[PDB]
């Protein structure tokens, strides 16, 4: 541990009729942008995800992590400004979180990202934090134990206070989507469900190897 | 059973002034797209439904089922990309569910789809799943018995965790719409109503024989 | 009784700058459409109401009743498709209900529609239907007694399950609007108010004699 | 008082880029419209209020009162139809109320309107009206007594049942805005706060002497 | 102190495709506008903040304070009217507050603004103000003690009654964003959390030295 890492799930919705039918130059420009980000060494793009078919207001997602938040701001603004892909898309939702130095987030461990991801914000009940620490730790122990049968699903739980309307950001990565569905269904059977205020919206996506795969399927 | 099937209710809203008045080529292209989907053998389009007059933000719906979710993603993106019908429509709502290996969904049995359908998402109360299994099973038995007076209405209840903001997807198919209305009204008289958080939005539609019947009624 | 009738309150909002200033041909076309509906004998247009000044997102309303819901769907689609008035308007809200075979809705009796109408959907509490039938009957008797001092206000309470997000559709018709306001205010003084979940949005309008009166006041 | 008066707070939001930079003719036309309203003698425009800086979706407000509601409808439609100012604005919110024949609204007395106004709708709790009349009258007496230290703030509480989604319309007029802020803060210290369901949105504005002052500040 | 100061957090969202690529003249015009505001001596612009990456519907924010609210209205309208930057932006959210003459807001003391800010509205529970003053003051003392471990984060709590939909405006200024995140997380561990109704939306931003730095990063 002992590392500071802001994380961002930037969710974009494609504007129909704006991308056009000739997309080779757009693909090349977006790929050059991401290669420049990678060679700069400040912002690490953990993944690019196709959100088609998940919900009506989202089309794709970029999950990237940087040591400072201003670097994420610069990368996000540059993506929206200097690339055609960012110019023909609307920002639908932004999930920001900060990891500060037991169990650590999967992206902190450096694990290989899974094929499928689900991402959602999380807000606990008002009395959750002032609850007796004995009871809170027991509830959290049961909640964690409920995920013992899913070693293939990696979980990221990162604090998100003051970086949005939420308190935590949760991200599940799995080779198969049905494993994520089963994990959520089984986690419904826990006492921690009694201390939940907000858990929406959900964003479920498939990791693409390169930006060309994403661009070639966007509408318009 | 012993087969995995993802299901999707893709709801689209027609943009006024975009379809135009000459629709023969649009009809032919949409029919060719659906015939190609059928001949590919991966995605099975269970139905196409006209949602006109049900609610303000919906115009039609496609109910299709595939073994893998990426196939549904590909079909959905292709519909929005390579057909004029998908290019002049906005995605209003997406209801995703996964059926995994009692009483099984109607589309799992392969029953003939009914003339009328009603589709809605469903979210249970926070304490529903950690409730005493005896009490939950008794409540579910009463809820099921309340629907034994409507043998002509087929019910699909499919888990929807992590595939959206919801927990279950419910679909009722009947030859007559008044049967669905009566079933919902009678199902209001059950104890399970005490454990409901979200059940909206509703989408009520009539099954069309072919895409031409749907296209010829959409607003110009 | 012994008659099945679906009812629809189709609420439309006028798009500014689309109707124009020359409206004689639009008036003639809309009148021809409504005369064709009347002469077809399937859909009965009970009223056309001007909603200007009631709320921000509504401009007028068509209240029509038909034996089958397919006929209402067809008439609604035809209005939105083959008339300039329907082409330059957006659907803001749709209230659907079904009357099936005590006290009957005013439109079932065939009473002359009042000059002023108010319309809203209604959703009861979760425990309303499983409440002890004696207590529910007493509450409903008190609620009905509260409306005995307003014989000039006719009330239509029609089930709306599965035809939208609601449970009941309520419509009050009166020669004067202050009578409706007083009736609602006095009905606030009832125990049934303890079993209400949703009762919005409201749509208050004045019945117009012919579509020309409505068209000549819509924003250009 | 033996007078019937409907009151309306019509809130409009200016469309950027539609008003233009040359506004003398627009000012003259709007002033002519309001002079015609005053001459006709049916609708009394109590005030015109600049709402800039109060909230994102509002730009100005017209507060007008008429004996019949159809007169208000005609004036509102005419403003949106036959004036450039009404043609380049969107209706953001409409607050309607009816005053029917103790303490009466300020506009019934005909008091000089204050420089600053705040306006909001109000919805009481479900059990407020069936509460024991002694307890309700005691609560209302305390609530009224809490406003003894603000004689310079005039309050208008008018029933709003069936004329929208609300129950009451509340308007506070003061020479200074800080007096309104202090009054609201002091009214927070009352038992009536335990019986409140809805009190938003708020509209705070400054009374303008003539429509030219309002038009000259709207965004181009 | 005896200083009466209205404060405003004007949040703007940039319209894509409206700013263009040549921004030198826009920068010069905006800088001239802000220099004129500073010279006039009525409205003091406390800060300009880049909000990119915080949320989907916000792009930047202006925090300015003036003795009278009409001066803030004039400055806001003038910014939206006479500058290209204000003409190519939409108002997303407005947070207004009034400070009337223990512990004072940071902007009242004149402290140097921090590099990072987090701004949100706040609404207490209905029974918060009529709670026993002993208990309320004890809860507030504990809440204040919870923030004594963060001397580097300056807090501004200003009443916001009748100037919007909220009750208080809260702003946290820090040299580092992680300090704000930690302060919010630690403040979750207080009894005052039991008396919260609304605390969203949040606006987290980085203070820019000049308007050129802000304009050069906005999407084209």
Numbering used by the authors:
A (entry chain A), B (entry chain C), C (entry chain D), D (entry chain E), E (entry chain B): 11 to 111, 117 to 235
Copy text verbatim from the article accompanying this structure deposition.
All ChdCs are homopentameric proteins consisting of protomers of 250–300 amino acid residues, each with two ferredoxin‐like domains, with only the C‐terminal domain having a functional coproheme/heme b binding site (Falb et al. 2023). In this study, we used cryogenic electron microscopy single‐particle reconstruction (cryo‐EM SPR) to characterize structurally the apo and heme b‐bound forms of actinobacterial coproheme decarboxylase from Corynebacterium diphtheriae.
It shows a complete absence of loop (108–127) densities for all five subunits. Missing densities can also be observed for the N‐terminal regions. In the cryo‐EM structure of heme b‐CdChdC, amino acid residues N6‐G235 were observed, while in apo‐CdChdC N11–P111 and S117–G235 residues were observed but there was no density for the N‐terminal residues as well as A112–R116 due to disorder. In principle, multiple distinct conformers of the loop can be resolved in cryo‐EM structures but dynamic disorder that we expect here averages out molecular density. The conformational change of the loop (L108–I127) in the apo structure seems to be accompanied by some additional conformational disorder of the N‐terminal residues (M1–L10) as they are located close to each other. The apo form of the protein exhibits greater conformational variability, as indicated by the lower accumulated populations of the first five clusters (78.5% for apo vs. 92.7% of the heme b complex). The apo form shows increased RMSF of loops 108–127 in both clusters 0 and 1 compared to the heme b complex; however, the effect is more significant for cluster 1 (open loop).
